[PDB]
């Protein structure tokens, strides 16, 4: 439900229609009364540009800052302040634990609507210290997550996530984990680890009840595509494609239904065509997907690697037909991947044979050692000079 704010937000951010999307996007904060944080929030959100606020123009004309955003903010705050005062004062005269708790949960929920990140931590802690039902406690954290994602800075969410982790364990409520799982996936798509995002999204689809979600239908369409990124074909074929779970989840996938088919058939040509389309329809729409580069690389590796891994020979003409990509282009993309050598294949253009070495030997395991090894090499030395002085 507050999750709807995010869905809308990806559209003015990406190019797929800038102006029209902005009014709608602006309305959900307009009611909540987001004003203090709003100007700072726009700057962070950008990683494919275009501000969701009126404080900057990037690609097209921005929607204006409504007066309503300011008016609802002042009214909601004044109310919250009056209510809380009687309760805080009453709390002292009466049972300390009960009265303050009820007051604090409400006070926190309004602070989160403004989007005050600091106001959300302070409000939360007092309730925890005092007596409070385990289900009720755990629910509270969901709001703090929603603001970090809203802000869509990687740093801020990492801080929230640490707190969320300590807290979930104490309470022990599984219904509450499901809502938590979605937020966790939403951050994952946002960085370079879709691999992680896939797991979270799949588990949640099978058993969910409609609380803290932006639209079930969009969410199911999205979930299948992410599973592909993480999962190579022997896992992908069983779980998603032929599995029982996908029917139970319900179908709204078709662009993606065809996509999975192309890897299984061993006919790659249609995979590449769909890849290009998937970036335009899903990714842009959604707020979460930065460092798009990762997504592309992995998907393209998946197609190449599965054919090559199975076959130490193919003839060039067959290999070219199956891949459905142009000859110069198939070569150039691979050239990056071969260097890493988890694939590790040669291509002849004189013998018309594409060879796969396919190391599952000492070569494979050793190459990774080297890459990790470079990072460790700089750090250790840097540490040694700083301390000496």
């Amino acid at each position: 439900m507050p999750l709807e704010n995010l869905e809308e937000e990806g559209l003015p951010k990406n190019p797929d229609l800038r102006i029209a999307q902005l009014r709608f996007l602006l309305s959900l904060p307009e009611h909540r009364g987001d004003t203090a944080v709003r100007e700072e929030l726009m700057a962070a959100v950008r990683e494919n540009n275009m501000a969701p606020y009126y404080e900057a123009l990037c690609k097209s004309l921005d929607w204006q800052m409504d007066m309503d955003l300011l008016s609802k903010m002042k009214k909601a705050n004044e109310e919250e302040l009056k209510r809380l005062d009687e309760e805080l004062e009453d709390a002292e005269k009466n049972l300390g634990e009960s009265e303050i708790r009820d007051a604090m949960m409400a006070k926190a929920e309004y602070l989160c609507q403004i989007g005050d990140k600091e106001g959300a931590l302070t409000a939360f802690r007092k309730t925890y210290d005092k007596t409070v039902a385990l289900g009720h406690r755990l629910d509270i954290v969901f709001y703090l997550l929603r603001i970090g994602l809203f802000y869509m800075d990687n740093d801020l969410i990492t801080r929230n996530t640490e707190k969320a982790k300590s807290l979930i364990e104490e309470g022990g409520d599984w219904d509450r984990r499901n809502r938590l799982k979605v937020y966790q996936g939403l951050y994952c798509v946002a960085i370079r680890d879709f691999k992680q995002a896939a797991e979270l999204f799949l588990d949640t689809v099978s058993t969910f009840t409609s609380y803290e979600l932006m639209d079930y239908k969009t969410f199911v369409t999205y979930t299948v595509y992410v599973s592909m990124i993480a999962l190579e074909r022997p896992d992908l074929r069983e779980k998603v494609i032929k599995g029982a779970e996908i029917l139970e989840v319900l179908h709204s996938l078709p662009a993606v239904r065809q996509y999975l088919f192309s890897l299984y058939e061993c006919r790659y040509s249609v995979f590449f065509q769909s890849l290009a389309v998937v970036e335009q329809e899903m990714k842009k729409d959604w707020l979460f997907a930065p460092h798009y580069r990762y997504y592309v690389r992995e998907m393209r590796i998946h197609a190449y690697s599965q054919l090559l891994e199975s076959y130490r020979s193919l003839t060039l003409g067959y290999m070219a037909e199956a891949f459905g990509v142009g000859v110069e282009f198939i070569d150039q993309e691979l050239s990056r991947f071969i260097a890493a050598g988890r694939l590790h294949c040669k291509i002849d253009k004189v013998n018309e044979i594409v060879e796969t070495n396919r190391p599952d030997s000492k070569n494979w395991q050793y190459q990774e050692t080297i890459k990790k090894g470079d990072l460790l090499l700089n750090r250790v030395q840097k540490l040694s000079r700083v301390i000496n002085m």
Binding site: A276, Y292, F329
Partner: peptide, 24 residues
């Protein structure tokens, strides 16, 4: 080239159409 993903959206579409008409 900062990120391959922008260029790649055009590449996959273009490359398939030409390749298909000719060989595949």
């Amino acid at each position: 080239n900062v990120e391959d993903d922008f260029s790649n959206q055009l590449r996959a579409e273009l490359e398939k159409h030409g390749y298909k008409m000719e060989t595949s």
